């Protein structure tokens, strides 16, 4: 049941009682400032685009006749639209004359596509008899 609470005593200096002290010291820290290398190395010379691919063009020349299964009323209607020329019929087909440069062969593809029986004829492709 013993208790020996002994403590030492030392002296020291320190700011107290609302005591304030300022002592700024740099020691040749910073006196001047200068260091920047901004040149922005960017120059636009040219792109450069070349093809050199071609040296030619398409082509398509054809003209003969087209047997369309329809009456005169239909012939003239096609001759004006497609640019053909209603000449005559062969009983159940009107042989129209397509203009020079028109793909009469392609036209028949638009007709038969719906269900029209037609025949691609020519006006000087086959040979004549004796």
Pick the closest to residue 112 from 66, 62, 64 (CA basis).
66
**Paired tokens of 12:** 């020291």
Cα separation, 65 vs 81, in Å, equals: 15
Pick the closest to residue 87 from 72, 107, 102, 104 (CA basis).
72
For residue 12, the SS3 value is: coil
Residue 118, beta-bridge partner list: 68
For residue 111, what are the CA distances in angstroms to 23, 94, 106, 107? 105, 13, 9, 7
DSSP labels, 16-55: -SS--------SS--S-----------------------S
Q: How many CB atoms lie within 10 A of CB 107?
A: 21
Q: Give the contacts of 102 (CB within 8 A, at least 6 positions apart).
A: 62, 63, 82, 83, 84
> Which structural technique was applied?
NMR
Cα separation, 62 vs 102, in Å, equals: 6
Cα separation, 100 vs 78, in Å, equals: 16
Is 127 buried (19+), middle (13-18) or exposed (0-12) by CB count in 10 A? exposed
């Amino acid at each position: 049941q013993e208790s020996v609470t002994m403590d030492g005593k030392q002296y020291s200096t320190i700011e107290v009682n609302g005591q304030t002290y300022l002592i700024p010291d740099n020691g040749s820290k910073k006196r001047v400032a200068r260091s920047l290398d901004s040149k922005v190395p960017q120059q636009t010379l040219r792109r450069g685009d070349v093809l050199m691919q071609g040296a030619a063009s398409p082509e398509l020349t054809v003209s003969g006749t087209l047997l369309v299964e329809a009456d005169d009323a239909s012939a003239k209607a096609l001759a004006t639209r497609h640019g053909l020329n209603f000449k005559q019929s062969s009983g159940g087909i009107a042989l129209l004359e397509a203009k020079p440069g028109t793909d009469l062969n392609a036209i028949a593809t638009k007709l038969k596509s719906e269900g029209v029986n037609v025949q691609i004829e020519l006006s000087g492709a086959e040979q004549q008899p004796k």
